[PDB]
Ligand binder design. Structure first.
Ligand code: IQ9
Ligand code: MG
Ligand code: ZN
Length: 313
């Protein structure tokens, strides 16, 4: 109970900032995550013996793919941590518990391929889950790991608290399906503009938690330009591998995924920032004002992508 995790001074200060990079040392990421749980949730939220065993089972069940990997897990969890710390009083005890765990687990056992590719390949998971295929798989993997002897980090909650936290996590992980993001944000925009947005409405909270999850998931675009730029190599490395596999099924992939159309990458980033990222962080800044630094960072990085095309880097 009297055992705090502590970070070296630079990490200690910088972890509080939205644009913090977790670093290249894998062996520190677990303790970074636990540090964030103790300051977000308290030293009491989770039996340390169990939390540590949960974290390492989850680490073990992410694969060594270029992007959708254990480093993405912890990066996405840190963004949620920054959002929760800057919006202390809007969130319940349960929500702080569920959401950092949802973020850590949201891409469990990802193979590095879109729901679209599973369906064109006719992968079994596409027969078992007809929409949000990988995302229902991720929640299924999370429940599996929670049920290993000595892994139930939630065992100390009441029956109902337990059921609420699993329903928070399930919605959170399903919301990371970007096909659902577009309508979710449209509705939040309408609801905030017409003034009907009410955070005691559970269905409204669910939508807000969904936008928070999309925001944390895309947070590579809110980092210092060298982080953003070097992460997009990892993102395109999976896209191109998926394009390759499409061609193997005798299908021309979309140019986004065709490694012969690298030239078109900066313009693709423009579409993504304008059509996805900027609107995401805009609506989130409108609903949660202290998240403005994610919107400012994202705009700076769109501007760095425009610079790339004009030949200025
Ligand atoms: C940079 N970043 N971060 C996350 C993702 C992403 O979508 N992944 C991670 C799970 C799916 C991307 C990303 O580059 N997406 C892109 C790039 C090009 N497009 C097209 C759609 C709109 C216009 C062109 N979309
Ligand atoms: Mg995912
Ligand atoms: Zn993700």
């Amino acid at each position: 109970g009297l055992m705090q995790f502590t970070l070296p001074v630079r990490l200690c200060k910088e972890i509080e900032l939205f644009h913090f990079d977790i670093g290249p040392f894998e062996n520190m990421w677990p303790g970074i995550f636990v540090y964030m749980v103790h300051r977000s949730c308290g030293t009491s939220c989770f039996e340390l013996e169990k939390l540590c065993r949960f974290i390492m089972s989850v680490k073990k069940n992410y694969r060594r793919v270029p992007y959708h990997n254990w480093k993405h897990a912890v990066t996405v969890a840190h963004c949620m941590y920054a959002i929760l710390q800057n919006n202390h009083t809007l969130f319940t005890d349960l929500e702080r518990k569920g959401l950092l765990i949802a973020c850590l687990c949201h891409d469990l056992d990802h193979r590095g391929f879109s729901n679209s590719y599973l369906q064109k390949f006719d992968h079994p998971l596409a027969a078992l889950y007809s929409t949000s295929t990988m995302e229902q798989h991720h929640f299924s993997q999370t429940v599996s790991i929670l049920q290993l002897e000595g892994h139930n980090i939630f065992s100390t909650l009441s029956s109902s608290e337990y059921e609420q936290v699993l329903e928070i996590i399930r919605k959170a992980i399903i919301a990371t399906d970007l096909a659902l993001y577009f309508g979710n944000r449209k509705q939040l925009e309408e609801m905030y503009q017409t003034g009907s947005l009410n955070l005691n409405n559970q269905s409204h909270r669910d939508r807000v938690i969904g936008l928070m999850m999309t925001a944390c998931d895309l947070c590579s675009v809110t980092k210092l330009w060298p982080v953003t730029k070097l992460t997009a190599n990892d993102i395109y490395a999976e896209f191109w591998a998926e394009g390759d596999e499409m061609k193997k099924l005798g299908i021309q992939p979309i140019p986004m995924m065709d490694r012969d159309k690298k030239d078109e990458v900066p313009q693709g980033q423009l579409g993504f920032y304008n059509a996805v990222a900027i609107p995401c962080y805009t609506t989130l800044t409108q609903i949660l004002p202290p998240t403005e630094p994610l919107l400012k960072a994202c705009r700076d990085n769109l501007s760095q992508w425009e610079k790339v095309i004009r030949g200025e880097e």
